[PDB]
Design a protein around this ligand. Sequence first.
Ligand code: U1H
Length: 330
Amino acid sequence: STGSATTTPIDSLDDAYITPVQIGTPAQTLNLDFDTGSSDLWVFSSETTASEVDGQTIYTPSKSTTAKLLSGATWSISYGDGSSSSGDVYTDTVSVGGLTVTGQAVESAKKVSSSFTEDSTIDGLLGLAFSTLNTVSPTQQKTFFDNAKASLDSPVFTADLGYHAPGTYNFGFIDTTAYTGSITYTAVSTKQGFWEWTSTGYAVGSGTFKSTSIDGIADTGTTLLYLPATVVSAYWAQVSGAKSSSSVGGYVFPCSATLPSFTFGVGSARIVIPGDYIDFGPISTGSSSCFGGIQSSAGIGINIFGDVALKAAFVVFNGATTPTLGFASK
Ligand SMILES: NCc1ccc(C(F)(F)F)cc1
């Protein structure tokens, strides 16, 4: 079997991407943020604290003939940005673009932090990292991908994110019409539960490529590209007037600038991120200071190949017994 669903940016900056997911019987369609950096499928629901719901579509397990309470199970998660959510768990039928998993753990939110409440477009998250990161206690649960894997034609999913445009998540197959050239595959470490790999280097604009190992994760659930301070300083030093601002929380640059591209290595292959992908617009409405799409990973403890990097490529998340990541230009 296979699945194919369209993913759409939530706003004019590609702050996050939402993909429709059918849950329960009859179907309840929720727009979830597919996140390769976490492993919990959680939704806003009829159990979410009323004051923490602002325009989201909620899952109501009582209206689903296939919903079953996963007795005694709870979940609690905190993300890298400081956001968090927690609640209880149901099992129900979940379909993504025609691909169905029966008995999938659907984590119902009882509480969500302010960032989730304020994002009216995001009805929940669908985790796609390794199931070892799942927060369900006392019985850890599998991701939608882990549960579907044995039914898939190929044990893979692909992310093809758009730049200010819709894109696609495919499960179980590689769409050979969605990329140019060949897909370069690279080794993955599952030791920290992420799609963790090692980039072979970088170039800034038309500069010479620097061969250097950069360990990091392929994370669809992170907006920006977070790399070592040395790399990030080298990039921003090419933009007149750019600087790191502690009051803003990162590198900013004059909105009047035309940004250089950023190239990252995948083995002997190269993925070029166009300069326009690195512009996140004014820091505040009407400001002439713009926020950079390449930021330092210094306070994080891990480099993150977020949407800024992933949307420049067709990306294969290969969940075979030896997991790998594939990158192709498009
Ligand atoms: N990295 C996971 C994640 C996804 C979305 C959000 C936000 F912005 F919607 F709250 C925060 C964190």
